[PDB]
Amino acid sequence: PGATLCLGHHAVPNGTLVKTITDDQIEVTNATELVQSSSTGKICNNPHRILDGIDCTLIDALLGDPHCDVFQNETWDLFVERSKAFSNCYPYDVPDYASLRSLVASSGTLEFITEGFTWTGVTQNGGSNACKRGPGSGFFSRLNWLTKSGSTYPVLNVTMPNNDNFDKLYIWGVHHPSTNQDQTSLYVQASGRVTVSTRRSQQTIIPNIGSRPWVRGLSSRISIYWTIVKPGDVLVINSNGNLIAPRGYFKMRTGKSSIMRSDAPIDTCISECITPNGSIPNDKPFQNVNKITYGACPKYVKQNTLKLATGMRNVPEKQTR
Amino acid sequence: PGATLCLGHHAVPNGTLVKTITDDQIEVTNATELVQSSSTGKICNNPHRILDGIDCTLIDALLGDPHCDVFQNETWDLFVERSKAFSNCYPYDVPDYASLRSLVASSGTLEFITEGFTWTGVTQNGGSNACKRGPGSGFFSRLNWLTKSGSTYPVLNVTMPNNDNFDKLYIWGVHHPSTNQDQTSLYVQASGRVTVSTRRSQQTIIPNIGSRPWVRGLSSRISIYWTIVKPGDVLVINSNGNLIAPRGYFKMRTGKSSIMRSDAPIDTCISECITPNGSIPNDKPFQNVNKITYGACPKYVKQNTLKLATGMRNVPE
Amino acid sequence: PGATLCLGHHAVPNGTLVKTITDDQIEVTNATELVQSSSTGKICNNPHRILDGIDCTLIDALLGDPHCDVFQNETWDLFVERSKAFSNCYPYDVPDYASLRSLVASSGTLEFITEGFTWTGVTQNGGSNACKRGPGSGFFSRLNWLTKSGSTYPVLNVTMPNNDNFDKLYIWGVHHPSTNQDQTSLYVQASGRVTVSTRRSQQTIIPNIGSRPWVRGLSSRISIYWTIVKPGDVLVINSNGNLIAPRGYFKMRTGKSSIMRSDAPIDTCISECITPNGSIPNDKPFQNVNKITYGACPKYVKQNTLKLATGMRNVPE
Ligand SMILES: *[C@@H]1O[C@H](CO)[C@@H](O[C@@H]2O[C@H](CO)[C@@H](O[C@@H]3O[C@H](CO)[C@@H](O)[C@H](O[C@H]4O[C@H](CO)[C@@H](O)[C@H](O)[C@@H]4O)[C@@H]3O)[C@H](O)[C@H]2NC(C)=O)[C@H](O)[C@H]1NC(C)=O
Ligand SMILES: *[C@@H]1O[C@H](CO)[C@@H](O[C@@H]2O[C@H](CO)[C@@H](O[C@@H]3O[C@H](CO[C@H]4O[C@H](CO)[C@@H](O)[C@H](O)[C@@H]4O)[C@@H](O)[C@H](O)[C@@H]3O)[C@H](O)[C@H]2NC(C)=O)[C@H](O)[C@H]1NC(C)=O
Ligand SMILES: *[C@@H]1O[C@H](CO)[C@@H](O[C@@H]2O[C@H](CO)[C@@H](O[C@@H]3O[C@H](CO)[C@@H](O)[C@H](O)[C@@H]3O)[C@H](O)[C@H]2NC(C)=O)[C@H](O)[C@H]1NC(C)=O
Ligand SMILES: *[C@@H]1O[C@H](CO)[C@@H](O[C@@H]2O[C@H](CO)[C@@H](O[C@@H]3O[C@H](CO)[C@@H](O)[C@H](O)[C@@H]3O)[C@H](O)[C@H]2NC(C)=O)[C@H](O)[C@H]1NC(C)=O
Ligand SMILES: *[C@@H]1O[C@H](CO)[C@@H](O[C@@H]2O[C@H](CO)[C@@H](O)[C@H](O)[C@H]2NC(C)=O)[C@H](O)[C@H]1NC(C)=O
Ligand SMILES: *[C@@H]1O[C@H](CO)[C@@H](O[C@@H]2O[C@H](CO)[C@@H](O)[C@H](O)[C@H]2NC(C)=O)[C@H](O)[C@H]1NC(C)=O
Ligand SMILES: *[C@@H]1O[C@H](CO)[C@@H](O)[C@H](O)[C@H]1NC(C)=O
Ligand SMILES: *[C@@H]1O[C@H](CO)[C@@H](O)[C@H](O)[C@H]1NC(C)=O
Ligand SMILES: *[C@@H]1O[C@H](CO)[C@@H](O)[C@H](O)[C@H]1NC(C)=O
Ligand SMILES: *[C@@H]1O[C@H](CO)[C@@H](O)[C@H](O)[C@H]1NC(C)=O
Ligand SMILES: *[C@@H]1O[C@H](CO)[C@@H](O)[C@H](O)[C@H]1NC(C)=O
């Protein structure tokens, strides 16, 4: 009478199906999920500095639309723009809006430094009932609407050197009156011109008189432009009418700052990865929540699930049942 | 006296070469090709709706060049532009031609809806011998060349709101006369201007008087522009000369439509994948026919062959 | 009396650590490095034709800034621009500088063919003290500053057909005077205009009078533009002032040419792969030296080391 010694391995009652080279479905004892497919629905307020735009786009906060005044000098890692945002100042357009929004978002700051521009022979601080600031007419806080003084608008020719060791961003504009009467009444000259230049570059804009769609009482518009002045360079502004002047410059920075469109609420929690759907955990290497992300995030993939086997092949005893 | 039992495997006299981790060439009993390297030379007319441009580019069909009038309100999944296509109307350019072509191709339709623009104090329906319709002069069917009425061209100022639930594409233009005499003769004012705007954006174009190369009798030109008006927005057009006015809008869609340059003939057959060389089968995961494709297609790779082994190592006798 | 026969494998006293699927560090008898992480610090002058820009950008050599005259008709596989480069001619800007630089770099040649343009009723060969050529005033060698003759500047209207079988690149410009007095003094007319066109395209530029920052004595500027004329097409130039005329065309080519910013010295040696840090060997499949490369190069990766095992597991003792 001898003895029997059998070698074997475990099995479990409920295995999981995984994919391999040779099988699209085969059963193993256990597996783990590699795709993050859910979010909290909330943007965590740490560890990144989140700035909720509320009723304001970044551009409106930049220009200084009065209901956006609370954003003066703000900073962010991620500026969050809401679908409820609205403009409530002079109607405007920005040629290459997308680029201005991008470069400001990336700079991470609206830090503004006022400069002593000398505008000889014109009236400063023009305002409109389309841009109410308290009970009276007003204007974008960072811009200076220049108009005639007495019976003249002389050729403006002013300079501002950059003697600092950082880049200066200047935001300026051009006023497009609705009629010839408006043009001559504001600027004397029948056709204006704005030329803004540095040593190496220049932009010249001719205003265009005529009607655009009525917005807050006005068929006129302002067009917004920008100019970056590097250390050792100089800004020159030259105009015989229709200039919407800068009051100063924004300080440019580089770093980790960006902007996101989302309606998710901001909550008190901690998450490295942010999507427009809300924050997601980053323990998994892949995610199917949103291709738009900010921070340390899993890579976006199209699959909603991918199972990595964490055990052997599951081979139950055949039952006659 | 015992017995011998030998274990073995098959072989064939002529195997096939495959690549592995350790070998560039190793012989196995069988393999299958993973790169589609051939085409029929023909574009199959199913299952995608193919519209052959013949003598017309998509942009000429859009503007309404007279030899392209047969394309009015046509639709497609894939518009096919031929190298023989030509223009035969007023000479024009489109700044950002590529974008206009792309967005129209993608919309998949030339469906045009006329709108009642009121152009007070100007003559409508200008024509040219460069763009013949029948025995007379003519013009692009979707555009309205405005000129002076009597001795004046007043400031034109019109509006058109978008109260529908779809995007409206408006095509319009600016006329660049060859001389000052032409400018004043057509528009009275010595310098024109066209401003087309919505609530949030605007384009302003100043025409430029002078000669360009002679095309069908003319050194003048038209420049073509577009404006998309979304639901709830409004179009305003403002001009004191040189406006080539829209007659209406094109109804925009989104979906699977595109455009391809090809000279391959269209045939009656079925193929999911189309290239400029013709349709290709899509049973293989890769293809080396053309990086330009439309439909359910193998991915383009640089290799002209890649063999997947479907059998063991071949060790012949 | 029997015998013992033991089967075994080698080991080495100091192995190397490698990564696998299951281990981030495991010891094998030998490995080899797959990431090139160092450079000579020098650009090898073979087998690619290297052209050192020295004090000149490609654009300054193109326009013909006098200290760049030595580059006339030069050719290259790789043009090397140095951080010490400076301009020393009329102050200028190029809208879409990056595109002009790219297309010229890619063409690989500054081969220039002078053409007999007829500029009726104007003075040719204008110069400035901002662009000295020898002791006296001068200008970009490939451009022709036109000004009034006597008391008039007539409308210029000239043509040049492309009857060759290659593409022609024309470089031209527009002068922006500092004051109204400068404008009328040079061109008579109070406002100029430059229109340069082919059959299919056109550019029209309005000059802008006013001050820019002082550079070499001047608050005026020149703006530089380009036009490519294909075989069978025609160039037309039309202007009533402010034109900086082409003297001819550059011959366009296609091929392997490019441009790189680098301060590495050029040396007599052989290397297929060039980076701004200098040439690197290309025996390894990957490199972490610089994402900017030219030639037959390893692919840029973020890792500074990756070890491929070239032996078994090392089990010492
Ligand atoms: C160029 O053409 C356009 C289109 O014809 C034209 O724009 C239109 O002008 C009128 C008059 O200014 C605008 O009417 C306003 O519309 C809003 C509704 O959105 C109303 O709130 C306004 O009502 C107040 O203002 C009136 C005074 O004008 C009062 O009578 C009234 O009691 C209210 O206080 C008013 O109806 C209309 O919106 C625009 N339309 C567009 C699309 O812009 C423009 O004026 C023309 N230009 C010239 C120079 O003629
Ligand atoms: C500005 O200068 C331009 C250059 O001189 C002037 O344009 C020229 O104007 C003349 C006469 O008005 C045109 O001549 C006609 O052109 C065609 C030729 O077209 C082409 O086709 C034929 C084949 O049919 C071919 O042989 C030619 O090579 C052309 O390619 C003829 O059919 C007519 O009989 C006649 O010759 C010139 O073509 C035209 N040239 C260009 C490049 O535009 C322009 O008039 C001047 N502007 C002003 C205001 O004076
Ligand atoms: C078989 O695989 C599954 C994963 O697919 C294993 O279940 C997971 O087990 C881990 C811990 O081993 C759980 O994580 C823990 O979560 C709690 C809070 O829920 C946290 O406080 C702990 O610090 C820890 O992170 C995880 O939730 C769980 N996940 C799921 C989806 O079940 C399971 O343990 C494996 N079985 C065997 C026998 O190994
Ligand atoms: C518009 O305003 C600007 C700034 O006030 C004027 O530009 C300035 O013009 C002066 C010449 O009057 C330049 O000075 C020169 O500097 C060099 C050395 O840098 C010196 O060697 C010369 O002797 C000369 O004094 C000054 O640099 C320049 N400023 C800038 C920023 O470029 C411009 O002339 C005004 N124009 C009109 C028409 O009002
Ligand atoms: C995260 O948000 C995205 C964006 O809203 C969701 O995906 C979209 O949902 C629409 C239907 O409303 C689908 O047809 C599209 O596939 C998605 N749109 C876009 C523009 O990508 C997504 O479901 C959300 N995911 C989670 C987990 O909440
Ligand atoms: C090759 O040159 C590049 C470009 O200057 C060097 O990269 C810089 O060096 C360190 C990190 O390596 C940083 O402080 C700089 O910001 C880097 N600049 C850029 C533009 O990447 C690189 O180190 C050099 N490599 C070798 C091997 O010499
Ligand atoms: C913004 O910051 C600058 C300097 O850092 C300061 O002078 C300025 O007054 C600040 N503005 C506001 C609104 O706090
Ligand atoms: C080789 O493999 C293919 C694909 O599996 C198969 O269709 C073919 O019949 C096989 N040929 C032979 C000779 O076994
Ligand atoms: C397809 O057309 C392209 C582009 O004309 C050509 O280079 C390629 O060789 C063609 N290939 C086949 C398989 O017909
Ligand atoms: C490792 O690799 C090469 C041979 O491929 C040789 O020069 C070197 O001596 C080897 N080193 C060791 C420790 O085996
Ligand atoms: C430039 O190109 C050719 C030389 O092949 C010739 O027409 C011309 O004289 C050359 N000029 C110079 C300066 O070398």
Residue numbers in the entry:
A (entry chain A): 9 to 329
B (entry chain E), C (entry chain C): 9 to 325
What sentences appear in the manuscript?
Since entering the human population in 1968, H3N2 influenza A virus has evolved extensively, especially in its hemagglutinin (HA), due to selection pressure from the human immune system. The HA glycoprotein on the viral surface is responsible for cell entry and is the main focus of the humoral immune response. The HA RBS is a shallow pocket on the apex of the HA1 globular head, and is formed from four structural elements: the 130-loop, 150-loop, 190-helix, and 220-loop, named after their location on the HA primary sequence. The HA RBS engages host receptor sialylated glycans and consequently is relatively conserved in sequence compared to the rest of HA1.
The Cα190-OH98 distances in HK68 WT (Glu190), HK68 E190D, Wy03 WT (Asp190), and Wy03 D190E are around 9.0–9.7 Å, whereas this distance in Fin04, HK05, Vic11, and Mich14 is around 8.5–8.8 Å. Relative to the WT HAs, the mutants bound more weakly or not at all to the array, but when binding was observed, specificity for human-type (α2–6) receptors was strongly maintained. Our structural and glycan array analyses imply that HAs in early human H3N2 strains favor Glu190 over Asp190 for binding to sialylated glycans, whereas the preference shifted towards Asp190 during natural evolution due to the change in the receptor-binding mode.
